[PDB]
């Protein structure tokens, strides 16, 4: 008799982020990966190269210059607000 | 008789982040990975290279220059607020 | 008769971060990894290289220059607030 | 007759971070890893290299220069506040 | 008849961090790892290298220069506050 009651009665004015889950090489099975996922300026360079990517003779030069003027200005991230003044000014 | 009551009655104006879970090479099974995941400027360089990536003879130069003028300005991260003044100013 | 009551009645205006879980090479099974995960400037260089990545003869130079002018300015991280003035100023 | 009552009645305006869990090479099973996890400037260089990563003959130079002008300014981390003035100024 | 009542009635405006858990190579099982985990500038260099990582002949130079101008300024870490003025100024 599984019973999940979430947020039954809401008279007011809220700001909500609900997530209700009810259950009864690289291999992934039977999962929930990302629901509210925020990835900002994420980088992956060499992921899951194949079987024997450099088998016998390899002269590999891996230079990774992460070098830049960047400006991430997020006034409210994954954050609800009922009554508020959210501002980014310059 | 599993019964989960979350946030039954809310008269006011809240700011909520609910997450209700009810249950009855690299291999991952039967999981919930990231629900409210915030990844800022995350980096992965060599992940899960294949079987025998440099087997016999390898001359590998791995230079990883993480070098940049960066500005992450987050006024409210994963943080709700009911009545408030959230500001980023310059 | 499992019964979980969380936050039954809320008249006021709160700021909440709820998480209710009710249960009845690298291998991970049957888990909940990250729910409110905040990863800022996280780095992983060599993770889970394959079977025999440098088997017989390897001349590996691993230079990892973590060197940059960076500015992470987070006014409120994973921290809700009901009535407040949250500000980042310059 | 397992019964968990958390935060039954809240008239006021709080700022809460609830987490209610109710239960009845590198291998990890049957766990909850990170719920409110905050990782700032975390680094992992060589994790879980494969079976026999440098088996017979290896000339490995591992130089790890962690050297940079960095500024992490977090005004409130994993810390809710009901009525308050939280400020980062310059 | 397990019964856990936490924070039954709260009239005022608090700032709370609740965590209620109710239960009835490197291998880890059946655990709760980190709930409110704050890791700042944590580093792990060589963790869980595979079976026989340098078996027969190895000339390994491990130089780890942890050398940088860094500024971590956290005004309130894992510390809620009801009525307060929390400030980082420069």
Instruction: DSSP for B6-55, please give it.
Output: ES-EE-S--EEE--EEEE---EEEEEEEEEEEEEES-EEEEES--SSTB-
Question: Is B43 annotated as contributing to ligand binding?
Answer: no
- Residue pair C4/B1 in contact by the 8 Å Cβ criterion: no
CB D73 within 8 A of CB C76: no
Q: How far is C76 from chain A (nearest CA, A)?
A: 10
Of the candidates E25, C26, A26, the residue with the CA atom closest to the CA atom of residue B49: A26
Q: Give the phi and the psi of residue E34 in degrees, each rounded to 5.
A: -140, 125
Buried/exposed code over E48-73 (b: 16+ C-beta within 10 A; e: otherwise) = bbbeebbeeeeeeeeeeeeeeebeee
Both tokens assigned to D88: 């980062």
* Nearest partner of C30 among E8, B68, A29, B16, judged by Cα: A29
Chains D–E, number of C-beta pairs less than 8 Å apart: 331
Spatial CB neighbours of B86, under 8 Å, sequence gap ≥ 6: A75, A76, A81, A84, A85, A86, A87, B75, B76, C75, C76, C86, C87
Q: How was this structure determined?
A: cryo-EM
Task: Select from C13, C50, C68 the Cβ nearest to the Cβ of A82.
Answer: C13
Both tokens assigned to A88:
């980014």
Residue E14 near residue D13 (C-beta atoms within 8 A): no
- How far from D72 is each of C41, D14, E17, E74, CA to CA, in Å? 10, 28, 23, 8
Closest CA to B8 of E2, A11, D18, A19: A11
Distance, in Å, from the CA atom of B45 to the CA atom of C44, rounded to the nearest integer, reads 7
Contact D8 E3 (CB under 8 A): no
Strands E20-23 and D20-23: what pairing?
A: parallel
Residues of D in contact with B25 (CB under 8 A): 50
Q: Among all chains, which residue has been given the structure tokens 């700001």?
A: A15
* Cβ atoms B4, A68 nearer than 8 A: no
Half-sphere exposure of residue A83: CA atoms within 13 angstroms, side-chain side: 9
CB E70 within 8 A of CB E41: yes
Helix (H) or strand (E) holding C20: strand C20-23
Which of C79, C83, C84 to mutate: most E Cβ within 10 Å? C79
Largest Cα–Cα separation, chain A: 69
Q: Do E3 and D3 touch (CB under 8 A)?
A: yes
Q: What is the rounded distance in angstroms from the CA atom of residue D65 to the CA atom of residue B69?
A: 18
Record the tokens describing residue A66, joined without a space.
Answer: 């992460």
**Gap sites in chain C (C to N > 2.5 Å), preceding residue numbers:** 24
C14 lies within 8 A of chain A by CB: no
User: What is the DSSP code string of chain E?
Assistant: --EEEES-EE-S--EEE--EEEE---EEEEEEEEEEEEEES-EEEEES--SSTB-SEEEEEEEEEE---EEEEES-BS--EEEEEEEE--
Chain B: closest CA distance from residue C34 (Å): 5
Min Cα separation B30/chain D (Å)? 10
Distance CA A75, CA A59 (A): 46
Geometric angle at alpha carbon C68, from C65 and C73, rounded to 5°:
135
| CATH annotation of B1-90 | 2.60.40.180
Distance between CA atoms of residues B79 and D79, nearest Å: 10
Task: Find the Cα–Cα–Cα–Cα dihedral B32, B35, B38, B43, rounded to 10°.
Answer: 20
Resolution (A): 3.3
């Amino acid at each position: 008799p599984l019973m999940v009651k979430v947020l039954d009665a809401v008279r007011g004015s809220p700001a909500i982020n609900v997530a209700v889950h009810v259950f009864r090489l690289t291999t992934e099975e039977e999962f929930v990966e990302g629901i509210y996922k925020v990835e900002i300026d994420t980088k992956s360079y060499w992921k899951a190269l194949g079987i024997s990517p450099f088998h016998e003779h390899a002269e590999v030069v891996f230079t990774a210059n992460d070098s830049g003027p960047r400006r991430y200005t997020i006034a409210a991230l994954l954050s609800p607000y009922s009554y508020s003044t959210t501002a980014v000014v310059t």
